[PDB]
Amino acid sequence: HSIRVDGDIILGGLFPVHAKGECGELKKEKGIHRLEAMLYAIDQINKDPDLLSNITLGVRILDTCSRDTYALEQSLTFVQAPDKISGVIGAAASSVSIMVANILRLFKIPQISYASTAPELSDNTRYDFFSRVVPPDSYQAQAMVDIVTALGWNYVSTLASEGNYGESGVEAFTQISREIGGVSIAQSQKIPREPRPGEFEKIIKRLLETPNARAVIMFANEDDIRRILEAAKKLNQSGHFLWIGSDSWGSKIAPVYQQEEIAEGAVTILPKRASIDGFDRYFRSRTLANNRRNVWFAEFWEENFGCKKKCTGLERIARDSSYEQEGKVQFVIDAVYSMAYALHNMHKDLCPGYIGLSTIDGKELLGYIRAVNFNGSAGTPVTFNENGDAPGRYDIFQYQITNKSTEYKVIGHWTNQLHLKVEDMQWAHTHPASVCSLPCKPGERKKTVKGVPCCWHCERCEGYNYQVDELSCELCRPNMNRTGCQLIPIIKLEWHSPWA
Amino acid sequence: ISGVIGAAASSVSIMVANILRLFKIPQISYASTAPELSDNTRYDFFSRV
Ligand SMILES: N[C@@H](CCC(=O)O)C(=O)O
Ligand SMILES: N[C@@H](CCC(=O)O)C(=O)O
């Protein structure tokens, strides 16, 4: 099960065409939908006269099944060269990307990822040849804490998925929330990706015990959120109502299927993306008859239309079928075009006067990759930072349930600073108050009390007063916090006093 | 392959350990004396005599 096309210079791809489901079921939105985008980009590049004249590109596309070990064991085909691979364009999960980068760096094959958002990959000591078209998962935590503090939420529960992405994201979120101030994690939970009442139902039944925390921040995978929602619906319509999800939830309508009322009013974040109209025409025209290139495509059809009853030779992929372009279909084109531009610059420099091609050096090719900027194929300039990342711009969506239909609509933005519109928002309950106790203020000389780390008494500190010298009410009207021993005036019998 | 008996050079041992740790194969070098391999964060399955 693979796609092999031959050309002067060819590239590799890694996509999660199969998912665990509820390699069990095809990933309609983040599988086939991205293979077709990569093939469309390759076809568009080949016909362009300006770029790679006399060089025809090819593809080596494989399946990861959303597993790091499986992708690692099938990425050995890239190094054993069989077909020689100039660069690898496919990586969709941080766990897959890290393991693939570890093997590829040894054999000096450049890699570009279109959907992996993990700060660990920002390290260039251990990942020399890794490049990225999306921002690292460090601005996303800042955006989530900004959303949490803007609406006054200080008592929240956090859930994460075991792995690089979930753990790194939840650690960054906790650090930024502590730095922001007043955001306190009542419960922090982790999920191991095994759907079982032992863990997932226990997570939902352990979030129940803290009723004051009515908001949940989650760093969980695409498949883990589905089990979270299913367990939430089973267990008395959930006890963790508000869900502030990261890009893994994104705006995917598939996970919330049959569990819609659970996610009513949730707020989710995605990378800022603009639709590509050119790919819309390409995808719809891909019939079962004509699209023989994709080996998996037939199976996708059986899932998409629930057909084999005999199929009617009139069904198509259109607005009725909810074509619904995936969010990260613009970064695949950017990655493929960046690699093509780097190869074009390399071959223009090395052998002037000959458009055609012998041996490619990974190090200098990667040096070319880090030093190329260009306007996007149709939407926006593409460039790499010093570490190979992309700038952080995020959009905010909310799972509103209109009477007619349930959908995500944009509710704001975040580029180093947060814009939001509360008026159009709709809530599950009525803002979801998530607080424990009133914050301490220098009201009658300040205080700070122990208890549950999320709770504080904030009583008075009776007596004298000073300006900023309040250290747990420490003495030098004593105030129990006397620091007026510094600025104290000495009074003596004045000359002009009447007693004098 | 239960285990791999090392290498006689530090560069060879490092390059072999990098590939072997991914597939979880223990390694025991008999003649590599570099102190870069003393790190256990990047060389999990490497040991030396
Ligand atoms: N950024 C996510 C995946 C994003 C996606 O697949 O949509 C991760 O690191 O796993
Ligand atoms: N310890 C030496 C090798 C000594 C030997 O092989 O005799 C090295 O790291 O290269």
UniProtKB/Swiss-Prot annotation, chain B:
The organism of origin for this protein: Homo sapiens
Section of the entire sequence shown: 147 to 195 of 908
Family listed: Belongs to the G-protein coupled receptor 3 family.
Domain of life where this protein originates: Eukaryota
Protein name: Metabotropic glutamate receptor 8
Classification of source organism: Eukaryota, Metazoa, Chordata, Craniata, Vertebrata
Binding site for L-glutamate: 10, 31-33
Function: G-protein coupled receptor for glutamate. Ligand binding causes a conformation change that triggers signaling via guanine nucleotide-binding proteins (G proteins) and modulates the activity of down-stream effectors, such as adenylate cyclase. Signaling inhibits adenylate cyclase activity.
Gene name of the record: GRM8
Subunit structure: Interacts with PICK1.
Subcellular location: Cell membrane
